Amino acid sequence: LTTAEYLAYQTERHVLTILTDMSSYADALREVSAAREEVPGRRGYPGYMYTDLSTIYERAGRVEGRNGSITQIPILTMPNDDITHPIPDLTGYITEGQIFVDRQLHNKGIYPPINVLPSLSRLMKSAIGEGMTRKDHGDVSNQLYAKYAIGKDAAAMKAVVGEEALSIEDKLSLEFLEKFEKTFITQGAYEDRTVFESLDQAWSLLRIYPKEMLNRISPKILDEFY
Amino acid sequence: AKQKMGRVMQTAAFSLAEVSYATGENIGYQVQESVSTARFKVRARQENVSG
């Protein structure tokens, strides 16, 4: 973070630090705290872990005077895959948004095992704008999230009510879920997808629907892109 | 189907009355006598309607 602060603010460049194993950092903080004869907090971790993680995280951000920026992707390792764990809880409190990697997705397929239902970005609306990237980004992403949720619901409902009894909007949603978890999310470890190419692929998946089915997308965007 | 079955039952009763009038006697006894085997049979089919 000191190197990022230097580069971004005294050099006017964008950084995007990627801190790995915040769980390992928290364990290191645990050992440093307990070496000073201090009682452990809730889950053994020091009570001031919130303050320390707040310093480490909030060391990032944009400033008015300088043209640089410090984005941050602190990559945690949730013990026992528990969100109620102190490190995930404090990180969710301090940071804005969260990206989840799913064990079910990892078992089912290949990189990246990221599920979109529990993963969201709080300042997404600012990044996905009109002048920056494309004007259809927000509508496409919202539509994809809604149809992925409906696809998961239909996949659960198929084994309950039979495949035939599913509605048209459920069969199409199941097909979209298959082509989504298998072609859109599924990305090679070395292949690079620009934002525009990713949006084009998202539209390619979204075109299996009738134009009336896509409800979250604005009518102008539907007329121009679909 | 209940309405249609009522209408069909009325039509069949009228047809049976006409047939009995044409024959001059009730064919019920003859039908009962010739009831050795049933020509009409119904086989159950396990259709999958919804779940």
Side-chain angles (χ1 to χ4, degrees), chain A residues 1-11 13-20 22 25-26 28-32 34-37 39-41 43-51 53 55-63 65-66 68 70-79 83-88 90-101 103 105-116 118 120 122-124 126-127 129 131-138 140 143-152 154-157 159-162 165-166 172-174 176-177 179-181 183-193 195-199 201-203 205-210 214 216-217 219 221-222 224-226, chain B residues 1 6 12-13 17 22 24 28 38 44 51:
Chain A
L1 275 297
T2 307
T3 291
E5 272 185 340
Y6 175 82
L7 293 170
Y9 304 138
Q10 322 189 1
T11 309
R13 77 210 310 151
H14 314 137
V15 193
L16 177 65
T17 51
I18 307 169
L19 318 171
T20 302
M22 290 331 284
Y25 174 70
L29 261 183
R30 182 141 51 63
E31 183 213 325
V32 171
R36 286 192 319 227
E37 302 285 310
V39 298
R43 194 161 271 91
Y45 293 128
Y48 64 97
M49 181 145 88
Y50 175 80
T51 301
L53 294 189
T55 57
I56 300 299
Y57 295 156
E58 300 274 50
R59 206 89 74 83
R62 285 185 53 205
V63 289
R66 289 88 193 272
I70 304 192
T71 312
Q72 217 172 38
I73 309 191
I75 291 179
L76 282 72
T77 299
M78 301 185 308
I83 297 169
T84 63
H85 195 266
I87 317 163
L90 301 183
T91 300
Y93 279 173
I94 308 157
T95 64
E96 58 254 50
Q98 60 191 359
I99 284 155
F100 273 88
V101 182
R103 282 196 164 283
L105 273 290
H106 184 58
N107 290 343
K108 274 192 231 163
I110 207 63
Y111 295 167
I114 286 169
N115 57 2
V116 297
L120 74 164
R122 214 160 301 284
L123 321 173
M124 183 165 147
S126 294
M132 61 215 98
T133 72
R134 220 147 64 188
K135 51 191 185 53
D136 70 272
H137 195 135
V140 168
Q143 188 70 42
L144 281 183
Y145 173 84
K147 290 308 165 194
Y148 179 86
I150 297 169
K152 274 292 211 53
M157 199 89 68
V160 176
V161 72
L166 288 153
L172 294 174
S173 183
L174 196 42
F176 160 79
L177 172 75
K179 264 142 91 173
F180 189 84
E181 306 213 319
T183 300
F184 184 84
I185 303 298
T186 300
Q187 178 161 292
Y190 280 171
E191 89 186 270
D192 188 50
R193 293 203 217 159
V195 171
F196 301 93
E197 282 152 341
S198 180
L199 282 175
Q201 294 186 347
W203 271 119
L205 282 71
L206 286 186
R207 283 185 184 102
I208 58 184
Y209 286 0
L214 306 167
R216 304 301 271 300
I217 297 169
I221 295 158
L222 270 193
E224 183 178 1
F225 286 89
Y226 187 92

Short mmCIF file of all heavy atoms in Angstrom, two decimals, chain A residues 46-110, unseen atoms left out:
data_model
loop_
_atom_site.label_atom_id
_atom_site.label_comp_id
_atom_site.label_asym_id
_atom_site.label_seq_id
_atom_site.Cartn_x
_atom_site.Cartn_y
_atom_site.Cartn_z
N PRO A 46 -7.31 -10.59 17.27
CA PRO A 46 -7.27 -9.40 18.13
C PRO A 46 -8.50 -8.53 17.94
O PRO A 46 -9.11 -8.50 16.86
CB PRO A 46 -6.00 -8.68 17.68
CG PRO A 46 -5.72 -9.20 16.32
CD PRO A 46 -6.18 -10.62 16.33
N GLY A 47 -8.88 -7.82 19.00
CA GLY A 47 -10.04 -6.95 18.94
C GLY A 47 -9.87 -5.80 17.96
O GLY A 47 -10.83 -5.38 17.32
N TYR A 48 -8.65 -5.28 17.84
CA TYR A 48 -8.36 -4.18 16.93
C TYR A 48 -8.12 -4.65 15.50
O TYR A 48 -7.59 -3.88 14.69
CB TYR A 48 -7.15 -3.39 17.43
CG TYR A 48 -5.86 -4.18 17.46
CD1 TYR A 48 -4.95 -4.09 16.41
CD2 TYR A 48 -5.54 -4.99 18.54
CE1 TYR A 48 -3.77 -4.80 16.43
CE2 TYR A 48 -4.36 -5.70 18.57
CZ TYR A 48 -3.48 -5.60 17.51
OH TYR A 48 -2.30 -6.31 17.53
N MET A 49 -8.49 -5.89 15.18
CA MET A 49 -8.39 -6.34 13.80
C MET A 49 -9.21 -5.47 12.87
O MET A 49 -8.81 -5.23 11.73
CB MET A 49 -8.84 -7.80 13.67
CG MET A 49 -8.71 -8.33 12.25
SD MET A 49 -8.27 -10.06 12.14
CE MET A 49 -9.89 -10.80 12.20
N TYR A 50 -10.35 -4.97 13.35
CA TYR A 50 -11.15 -4.07 12.52
C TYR A 50 -10.38 -2.80 12.19
O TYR A 50 -10.38 -2.36 11.04
CB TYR A 50 -12.47 -3.73 13.21
CG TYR A 50 -13.29 -2.70 12.47
CD1 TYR A 50 -14.07 -3.07 11.37
CD2 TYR A 50 -13.29 -1.37 12.86
CE1 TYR A 50 -14.82 -2.13 10.69
CE2 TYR A 50 -14.04 -0.43 12.18
CZ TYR A 50 -14.80 -0.82 11.10
OH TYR A 50 -15.55 0.12 10.42
N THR A 51 -9.70 -2.22 13.18
CA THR A 51 -8.91 -1.02 12.92
C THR A 51 -7.76 -1.30 11.97
O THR A 51 -7.50 -0.51 11.05
CB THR A 51 -8.40 -0.44 14.24
OG1 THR A 51 -9.50 -0.12 15.09
CG2 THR A 51 -7.59 0.82 13.98
N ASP A 52 -7.05 -2.41 12.17
CA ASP A 52 -5.91 -2.72 11.31
C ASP A 52 -6.35 -2.97 9.87
O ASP A 52 -5.77 -2.43 8.92
CB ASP A 52 -5.15 -3.93 11.86
N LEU A 53 -7.39 -3.79 9.69
CA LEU A 53 -7.92 -4.03 8.36
C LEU A 53 -8.48 -2.76 7.74
O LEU A 53 -8.39 -2.57 6.53
CB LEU A 53 -8.99 -5.12 8.40
CG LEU A 53 -8.51 -6.52 8.77
CD1 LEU A 53 -9.62 -7.54 8.56
CD2 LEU A 53 -7.28 -6.90 7.98
N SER A 54 -9.06 -1.87 8.56
CA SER A 54 -9.54 -0.60 8.04
C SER A 54 -8.40 0.25 7.51
O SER A 54 -8.51 0.86 6.45
CB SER A 54 -10.31 0.15 9.12
N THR A 55 -7.28 0.29 8.24
CA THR A 55 -6.11 1.01 7.73
C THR A 55 -5.64 0.41 6.41
O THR A 55 -5.48 1.13 5.41
CB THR A 55 -4.99 0.99 8.77
OG1 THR A 55 -4.66 -0.37 9.09
CG2 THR A 55 -5.40 1.72 10.03
N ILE A 56 -5.47 -0.91 6.38
CA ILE A 56 -4.95 -1.57 5.18
C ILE A 56 -5.87 -1.34 3.99
O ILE A 56 -5.41 -1.07 2.87
CB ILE A 56 -4.73 -3.07 5.44
CG1 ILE A 56 -3.73 -3.27 6.58
CG2 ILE A 56 -4.25 -3.77 4.19
CD1 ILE A 56 -2.38 -2.68 6.29
N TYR A 57 -7.18 -1.44 4.20
CA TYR A 57 -8.12 -1.26 3.10
C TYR A 57 -8.22 0.20 2.68
O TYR A 57 -7.93 0.55 1.54
CB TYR A 57 -9.49 -1.81 3.49
CG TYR A 57 -9.52 -3.30 3.72
CD1 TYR A 57 -10.48 -3.88 4.54
CD2 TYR A 57 -8.58 -4.13 3.12
CE1 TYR A 57 -10.50 -5.24 4.75
CE2 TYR A 57 -8.60 -5.49 3.33
CZ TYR A 57 -9.56 -6.04 4.15
OH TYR A 57 -9.58 -7.40 4.36
N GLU A 58 -8.61 1.07 3.61
CA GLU A 58 -8.83 2.48 3.32
C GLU A 58 -7.55 3.21 2.93
O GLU A 58 -7.58 4.40 2.63
CB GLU A 58 -9.47 3.17 4.53
CG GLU A 58 -10.81 2.60 4.94
CD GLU A 58 -11.97 3.20 4.18
OE1 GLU A 58 -11.91 3.25 2.93
OE2 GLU A 58 -12.95 3.64 4.82
N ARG A 59 -6.42 2.50 2.93
CA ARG A 59 -5.24 3.06 2.27
C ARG A 59 -5.43 3.23 0.77
O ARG A 59 -4.54 3.78 0.11
CB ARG A 59 -4.02 2.18 2.54
CG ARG A 59 -2.70 2.91 2.47
CD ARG A 59 -2.32 3.50 3.81
NE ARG A 59 -1.88 2.46 4.74
CZ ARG A 59 -0.66 1.96 4.77
NH1 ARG A 59 0.28 2.39 3.94
NH2 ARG A 59 -0.36 1.02 5.66
N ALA A 60 -6.55 2.79 0.22
CA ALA A 60 -6.85 2.89 -1.21
C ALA A 60 -7.90 3.96 -1.47
O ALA A 60 -8.63 4.39 -0.57
CB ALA A 60 -7.33 1.54 -1.74
N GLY A 61 -7.97 4.40 -2.72
CA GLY A 61 -8.95 5.38 -3.13
C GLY A 61 -8.41 6.51 -3.99
O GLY A 61 -7.20 6.68 -4.10
N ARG A 62 -9.31 7.28 -4.59
CA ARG A 62 -8.94 8.40 -5.44
C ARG A 62 -8.85 9.69 -4.63
O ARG A 62 -9.45 9.82 -3.56
CB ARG A 62 -9.95 8.57 -6.58
CG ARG A 62 -9.83 7.54 -7.68
CD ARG A 62 -10.79 7.85 -8.81
NE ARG A 62 -10.62 9.21 -9.30
CZ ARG A 62 -11.57 9.90 -9.91
NH1 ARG A 62 -12.78 9.39 -10.11
NH2 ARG A 62 -11.31 11.13 -10.34
N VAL A 63 -8.11 10.66 -5.16
CA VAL A 63 -7.96 11.96 -4.54
C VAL A 63 -8.23 13.04 -5.58
O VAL A 63 -8.09 12.83 -6.79
CB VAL A 63 -6.57 12.16 -3.90
CG1 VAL A 63 -6.44 11.30 -2.67
CG2 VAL A 63 -5.49 11.83 -4.91
N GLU A 64 -8.62 14.22 -5.09
CA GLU A 64 -9.00 15.31 -5.98
C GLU A 64 -7.79 15.91 -6.69
O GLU A 64 -7.82 16.15 -7.90
CB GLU A 64 -9.75 16.39 -5.20
N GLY A 65 -6.72 16.17 -5.94
CA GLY A 65 -5.58 16.86 -6.52
C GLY A 65 -4.87 16.06 -7.59
O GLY A 65 -4.41 16.61 -8.60
N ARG A 66 -4.76 14.75 -7.40
CA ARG A 66 -3.96 13.90 -8.26
C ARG A 66 -4.83 13.11 -9.22
O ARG A 66 -5.99 12.79 -8.93
CB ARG A 66 -3.10 12.94 -7.42
CG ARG A 66 -1.98 13.63 -6.67
CD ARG A 66 -2.43 14.15 -5.32
NE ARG A 66 -1.47 15.07 -4.73
CZ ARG A 66 -0.44 14.70 -3.97
NH1 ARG A 66 -0.21 13.43 -3.70
NH2 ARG A 66 0.37 15.63 -3.48
N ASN A 67 -4.26 12.79 -10.38
CA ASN A 67 -4.95 12.05 -11.42
C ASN A 67 -4.81 10.54 -11.27
O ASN A 67 -5.32 9.79 -12.10
CB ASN A 67 -4.45 12.48 -12.80
N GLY A 68 -4.12 10.08 -10.22
CA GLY A 68 -3.94 8.67 -9.98
C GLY A 68 -5.06 8.08 -9.13
O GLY A 68 -5.96 8.77 -8.66
N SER A 69 -4.98 6.77 -8.95
CA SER A 69 -5.98 6.03 -8.20
C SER A 69 -5.35 4.80 -7.59
O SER A 69 -4.33 4.31 -8.07
CB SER A 69 -7.16 5.63 -9.09
N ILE A 70 -5.96 4.31 -6.51
CA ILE A 70 -5.53 3.07 -5.86
C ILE A 70 -6.77 2.20 -5.71
O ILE A 70 -7.56 2.39 -4.79
CB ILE A 70 -4.88 3.32 -4.49
CG1 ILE A 70 -3.71 4.28 -4.62
CG2 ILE A 70 -4.41 2.01 -3.90
CD1 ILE A 70 -2.87 4.33 -3.38
N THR A 71 -6.95 1.26 -6.63
CA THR A 71 -7.97 0.25 -6.45
C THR A 71 -7.40 -0.91 -5.66
O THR A 71 -6.18 -1.10 -5.58
CB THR A 71 -8.50 -0.20 -7.81
OG1 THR A 71 -8.79 0.96 -8.60
CG2 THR A 71 -9.77 -1.00 -7.66
N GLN A 72 -8.28 -1.70 -5.05
CA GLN A 72 -7.84 -2.76 -4.16
C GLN A 72 -8.69 -4.00 -4.36
O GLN A 72 -9.92 -3.90 -4.45
CB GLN A 72 -7.91 -2.31 -2.71
CG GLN A 72 -6.78 -2.82 -1.84
CD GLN A 72 -6.81 -2.18 -0.48
OE1 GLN A 72 -7.87 -1.97 0.09
NE2 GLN A 72 -5.63 -1.89 0.06
N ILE A 73 -8.04 -5.15 -4.44
CA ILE A 73 -8.74 -6.44 -4.48
C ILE A 73 -8.14 -7.33 -3.40
O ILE A 73 -7.37 -8.25 -3.72
CB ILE A 73 -8.64 -7.09 -5.87
CG1 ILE A 73 -9.06 -6.10 -6.96
CG2 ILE A 73 -9.53 -8.31 -5.94
CD1 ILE A 73 -9.23 -6.74 -8.31
N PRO A 74 -8.44 -7.10 -2.13
CA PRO A 74 -7.91 -7.98 -1.08
C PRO A 74 -8.56 -9.35 -1.14
O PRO A 74 -9.76 -9.48 -0.91
CB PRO A 74 -8.28 -7.25 0.22
CG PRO A 74 -8.74 -5.88 -0.20
CD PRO A 74 -9.31 -6.05 -1.57
N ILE A 75 -7.77 -10.38 -1.46
CA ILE A 75 -8.31 -11.71 -1.69
C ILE A 75 -8.21 -12.49 -0.38
O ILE A 75 -7.12 -12.82 0.08
CB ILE A 75 -7.59 -12.42 -2.84
CG1 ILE A 75 -7.94 -11.74 -4.16
CG2 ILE A 75 -7.95 -13.89 -2.87
CD1 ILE A 75 -7.27 -12.32 -5.35
N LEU A 76 -9.36 -12.77 0.21
CA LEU A 76 -9.44 -13.48 1.48
C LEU A 76 -9.51 -14.98 1.25
O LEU A 76 -9.67 -15.47 0.13
CB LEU A 76 -10.65 -13.03 2.29
CG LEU A 76 -10.58 -11.70 3.04
CD1 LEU A 76 -10.63 -10.52 2.09
CD2 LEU A 76 -11.71 -11.63 4.05
N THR A 77 -9.38 -15.72 2.35
CA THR A 77 -9.57 -17.17 2.37
C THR A 77 -10.47 -17.48 3.56
O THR A 77 -10.00 -17.53 4.70
CB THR A 77 -8.23 -17.91 2.46
OG1 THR A 77 -7.42 -17.58 1.33
CG2 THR A 77 -8.46 -19.41 2.50
N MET A 78 -11.75 -17.67 3.29
CA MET A 78 -12.72 -17.87 4.37
C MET A 78 -12.50 -19.22 5.03
O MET A 78 -12.62 -20.25 4.36
CB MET A 78 -14.14 -17.76 3.83
CG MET A 78 -14.44 -16.43 3.17
SD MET A 78 -16.17 -16.27 2.67
CE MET A 78 -16.39 -17.78 1.72
N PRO A 79 -12.20 -19.28 6.33
CA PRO A 79 -12.05 -20.57 7.00
C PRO A 79 -13.40 -21.26 7.14
O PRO A 79 -14.39 -20.65 7.53
CB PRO A 79 -11.46 -20.21 8.36
CG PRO A 79 -10.92 -18.82 8.19
CD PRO A 79 -11.85 -18.16 7.22
N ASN A 80 -13.43 -22.55 6.80
CA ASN A 80 -14.65 -23.37 6.81
C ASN A 80 -15.74 -22.79 5.92
O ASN A 80 -16.91 -23.14 6.07
CB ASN A 80 -15.18 -23.56 8.24
N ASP A 81 -15.36 -21.91 4.99
CA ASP A 81 -16.30 -21.28 4.05
C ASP A 81 -17.45 -20.60 4.80
O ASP A 81 -18.62 -20.71 4.42
CB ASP A 81 -16.82 -22.29 3.04
N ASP A 82 -17.11 -19.89 5.87
CA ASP A 82 -18.09 -19.23 6.72
C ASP A 82 -17.97 -17.72 6.54
O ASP A 82 -16.90 -17.14 6.78
CB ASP A 82 -17.88 -19.61 8.19
N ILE A 83 -19.06 -17.09 6.11
CA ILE A 83 -19.08 -15.63 5.98
C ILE A 83 -19.12 -14.95 7.34
O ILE A 83 -18.55 -13.86 7.50
CB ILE A 83 -20.27 -15.19 5.11
CG1 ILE A 83 -20.12 -15.75 3.70
CG2 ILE A 83 -20.37 -13.68 5.05
CD1 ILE A 83 -21.36 -15.59 2.85
N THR A 84 -19.75 -15.57 8.34
CA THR A 84 -19.79 -15.01 9.69
C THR A 84 -18.42 -14.97 10.34
O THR A 84 -18.30 -14.44 11.45
CB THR A 84 -20.74 -15.83 10.57
OG1 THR A 84 -20.26 -17.17 10.68
CG2 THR A 84 -22.14 -15.85 9.96
N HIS A 85 -17.39 -15.52 9.70
CA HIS A 85 -16.04 -15.48 10.23
C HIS A 85 -15.58 -14.03 10.35
O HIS A 85 -15.96 -13.18 9.54
CB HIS A 85 -15.11 -16.28 9.32
CG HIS A 85 -13.79 -16.60 9.93
ND1 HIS A 85 -12.68 -15.81 9.76
CD2 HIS A 85 -13.40 -17.63 10.72
CE1 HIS A 85 -11.66 -16.34 10.41
NE2 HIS A 85 -12.07 -17.45 11.00
N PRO A 86 -14.78 -13.71 11.38
CA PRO A 86 -14.43 -12.30 11.62
C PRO A 86 -13.74 -11.62 10.46
O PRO A 86 -14.04 -10.45 10.18
CB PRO A 86 -13.51 -12.39 12.84
CG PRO A 86 -13.95 -13.60 13.55
CD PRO A 86 -14.33 -14.58 12.48
N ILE A 87 -12.83 -12.30 9.77
CA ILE A 87 -12.10 -11.66 8.67
C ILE A 87 -13.07 -11.32 7.55
O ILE A 87 -13.08 -10.16 7.09
CB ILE A 87 -10.94 -12.54 8.18
CG1 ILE A 87 -10.17 -13.14 9.35
CG2 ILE A 87 -10.00 -11.73 7.30
CD1 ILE A 87 -9.30 -14.31 8.96
N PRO A 88 -13.90 -12.26 7.06
CA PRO A 88 -14.90 -11.86 6.05
C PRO A 88 -15.86 -10.80 6.53
O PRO A 88 -16.21 -9.91 5.75
CB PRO A 88 -15.61 -13.18 5.74
CG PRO A 88 -14.61 -14.22 6.03
CD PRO A 88 -13.88 -13.72 7.23
N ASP A 89 -16.29 -10.85 7.79
CA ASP A 89 -17.26 -9.86 8.28
C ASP A 89 -16.65 -8.46 8.27
O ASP A 89 -17.25 -7.51 7.75
CB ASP A 89 -17.73 -10.24 9.68
N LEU A 90 -15.46 -8.31 8.85
CA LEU A 90 -14.82 -7.01 8.89
C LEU A 90 -14.45 -6.52 7.50
O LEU A 90 -14.56 -5.32 7.21
CB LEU A 90 -13.58 -7.06 9.79
CG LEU A 90 -13.86 -7.48 11.24
CD1 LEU A 90 -12.59 -7.44 12.07
CD2 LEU A 90 -14.93 -6.59 11.85
N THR A 91 -14.01 -7.43 6.62
CA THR A 91 -13.69 -7.02 5.26
C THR A 91 -14.93 -6.54 4.52
O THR A 91 -14.88 -5.54 3.79
CB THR A 91 -13.02 -8.17 4.51
OG1 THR A 91 -11.81 -8.54 5.19
CG2 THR A 91 -12.67 -7.74 3.10
N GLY A 92 -16.06 -7.23 4.69
CA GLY A 92 -17.29 -6.77 4.08
C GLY A 92 -17.74 -5.44 4.63
O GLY A 92 -18.28 -4.60 3.90
N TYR A 93 -17.53 -5.21 5.93
CA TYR A 93 -17.88 -3.93 6.53
C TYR A 93 -17.04 -2.80 5.93
O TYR A 93 -17.58 -1.78 5.48
CB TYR A 93 -17.70 -3.98 8.04
CG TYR A 93 -18.85 -4.61 8.78
CD1 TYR A 93 -18.78 -4.87 10.14
CD2 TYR A 93 -20.02 -4.95 8.12
CE1 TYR A 93 -19.83 -5.45 10.82
CE2 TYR A 93 -21.08 -5.53 8.79
CZ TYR A 93 -20.98 -5.77 10.14
OH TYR A 93 -22.03 -6.35 10.81
N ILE A 94 -15.72 -2.96 5.93
CA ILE A 94 -14.84 -1.87 5.50
C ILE A 94 -14.95 -1.65 4.00
O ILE A 94 -15.09 -0.51 3.53
CB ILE A 94 -13.39 -2.14 5.93
CG1 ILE A 94 -13.33 -2.47 7.42
CG2 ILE A 94 -12.51 -0.95 5.61
CD1 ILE A 94 -12.11 -3.27 7.81
N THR A 95 -14.88 -2.72 3.22
CA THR A 95 -14.84 -2.62 1.77
C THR A 95 -16.25 -2.46 1.20
O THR A 95 -17.26 -2.64 1.89
CB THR A 95 -14.17 -3.84 1.16
OG1 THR A 95 -14.95 -5.01 1.44
CG2 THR A 95 -12.78 -4.03 1.75
N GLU A 96 -16.31 -2.12 -0.08
CA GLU A 96 -17.56 -1.97 -0.82
C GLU A 96 -17.63 -3.05 -1.89
O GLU A 96 -16.74 -3.14 -2.75
CB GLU A 96 -17.69 -0.56 -1.40
CG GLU A 96 -16.56 -0.15 -2.34
CD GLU A 96 -15.61 0.84 -1.69
OE1 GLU A 96 -15.16 0.58 -0.56
OE2 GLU A 96 -15.31 1.87 -2.32
N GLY A 97 -18.66 -3.88 -1.83
CA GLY A 97 -18.82 -4.99 -2.75
C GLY A 97 -18.06 -6.21 -2.28
O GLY A 97 -17.38 -6.21 -1.25
N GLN A 98 -18.20 -7.28 -3.06
CA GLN A 98 -17.56 -8.55 -2.76
C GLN A 98 -17.72 -9.49 -3.95
O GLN A 98 -18.75 -9.47 -4.62
CB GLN A 98 -18.16 -9.19 -1.50
CG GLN A 98 -19.64 -9.47 -1.60
CD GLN A 98 -20.25 -9.85 -0.26
OE1 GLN A 98 -19.56 -9.91 0.75
NE2 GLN A 98 -21.56 -10.09 -0.26
N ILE A 99 -16.68 -10.28 -4.22
CA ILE A 99 -16.71 -11.30 -5.26
C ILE A 99 -16.50 -12.65 -4.60
O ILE A 99 -15.51 -12.85 -3.88
CB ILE A 99 -15.64 -11.04 -6.34
CG1 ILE A 99 -16.07 -9.89 -7.25
CG2 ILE A 99 -15.38 -12.29 -7.15
CD1 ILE A 99 -14.92 -9.19 -7.92
N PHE A 100 -17.42 -13.58 -4.85
CA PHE A 100 -17.40 -14.89 -4.23
C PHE A 100 -16.92 -15.94 -5.22
O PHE A 100 -17.38 -15.97 -6.37
CB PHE A 100 -18.78 -15.28 -3.70
CG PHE A 100 -19.06 -14.80 -2.31
CD1 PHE A 100 -19.59 -13.54 -2.09
CD2 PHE A 100 -18.80 -15.61 -1.22
CE1 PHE A 100 -19.86 -13.10 -0.82
CE2 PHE A 100 -19.06 -15.17 0.06
CZ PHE A 100 -19.59 -13.92 0.26
N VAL A 101 -16.00 -16.79 -4.78
CA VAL A 101 -15.62 -17.99 -5.51
C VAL A 101 -16.32 -19.17 -4.87
O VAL A 101 -16.30 -19.32 -3.64
CB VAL A 101 -14.09 -18.18 -5.52
CG1 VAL A 101 -13.71 -19.40 -6.32
CG2 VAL A 101 -13.42 -16.94 -6.09
N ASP A 102 -16.96 -20.00 -5.69
CA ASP A 102 -17.89 -21.02 -5.20
C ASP A 102 -17.29 -22.41 -5.34
O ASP A 102 -16.79 -22.79 -6.40
CB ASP A 102 -19.22 -20.95 -5.96
N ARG A 103 -17.37 -23.18 -4.25
CA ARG A 103 -16.91 -24.57 -4.28
C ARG A 103 -17.74 -25.40 -5.25
O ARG A 103 -17.20 -26.27 -5.94
CB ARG A 103 -16.96 -25.17 -2.88
CG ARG A 103 -15.82 -24.75 -1.98
CD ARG A 103 -15.71 -25.66 -0.77
NE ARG A 103 -14.42 -25.51 -0.09
CZ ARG A 103 -13.29 -26.03 -0.53
NH1 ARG A 103 -13.23 -26.75 -1.64
NH2 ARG A 103 -12.17 -25.82 0.17
N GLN A 104 -19.05 -25.15 -5.30
CA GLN A 104 -19.90 -25.87 -6.25
C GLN A 104 -19.47 -25.59 -7.68
O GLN A 104 -19.40 -26.50 -8.51
CB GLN A 104 -21.36 -25.50 -6.02
N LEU A 105 -19.19 -24.32 -7.99
CA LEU A 105 -18.73 -23.97 -9.33
C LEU A 105 -17.38 -24.61 -9.64
O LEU A 105 -17.16 -25.09 -10.76
CB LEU A 105 -18.64 -22.45 -9.48
CG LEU A 105 -19.89 -21.68 -9.91
CD1 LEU A 105 -20.22 -21.96 -11.36
CD2 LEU A 105 -21.09 -21.98 -9.02
N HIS A 106 -16.47 -24.62 -8.66
CA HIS A 106 -15.17 -25.24 -8.86
C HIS A 106 -15.30 -26.74 -9.14
O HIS A 106 -14.61 -27.27 -10.01
CB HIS A 106 -14.28 -25.01 -7.64
CG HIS A 106 -12.89 -25.53 -7.80
ND1 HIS A 106 -12.05 -25.13 -8.81
CD2 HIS A 106 -12.19 -26.43 -7.07
CE1 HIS A 106 -10.89 -25.75 -8.70
NE2 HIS A 106 -10.95 -26.55 -7.65
N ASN A 107 -16.17 -27.42 -8.39
CA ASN A 107 -16.40 -28.84 -8.63
C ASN A 107 -17.04 -29.07 -10.00
O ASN A 107 -16.68 -30.01 -10.72
CB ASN A 107 -17.27 -29.43 -7.53
CG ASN A 107 -16.54 -29.52 -6.20
OD1 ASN A 107 -15.32 -29.43 -6.14
ND2 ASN A 107 -17.30 -29.69 -5.12
N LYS A 108 -18.00 -28.22 -10.37
CA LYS A 108 -18.72 -28.41 -11.62
C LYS A 108 -17.84 -28.16 -12.84
O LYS A 108 -18.00 -28.83 -13.86
CB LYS A 108 -19.94 -27.50 -11.67
CG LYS A 108 -21.18 -28.08 -11.01
CD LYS A 108 -22.41 -27.26 -11.36
CE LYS A 108 -23.19 -26.85 -10.13
NZ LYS A 108 -24.13 -25.73 -10.41
N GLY A 109 -16.91 -27.20 -12.75
CA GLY A 109 -16.19 -26.81 -13.95
C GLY A 109 -14.80 -26.24 -13.74
O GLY A 109 -14.03 -26.74 -12.91
N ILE A 110 -14.48 -25.19 -14.49
CA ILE A 110 -13.12 -24.66 -14.59
C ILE A 110 -13.17 -23.16 -14.31
O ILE A 110 -14.22 -22.60 -13.97
CB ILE A 110 -12.48 -24.97 -15.96
CG1 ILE A 110 -10.96 -25.05 -15.87
CG2 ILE A 110 -12.94 -23.98 -17.03
CD1 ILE A 110 -10.45 -26.17 -14.98
#
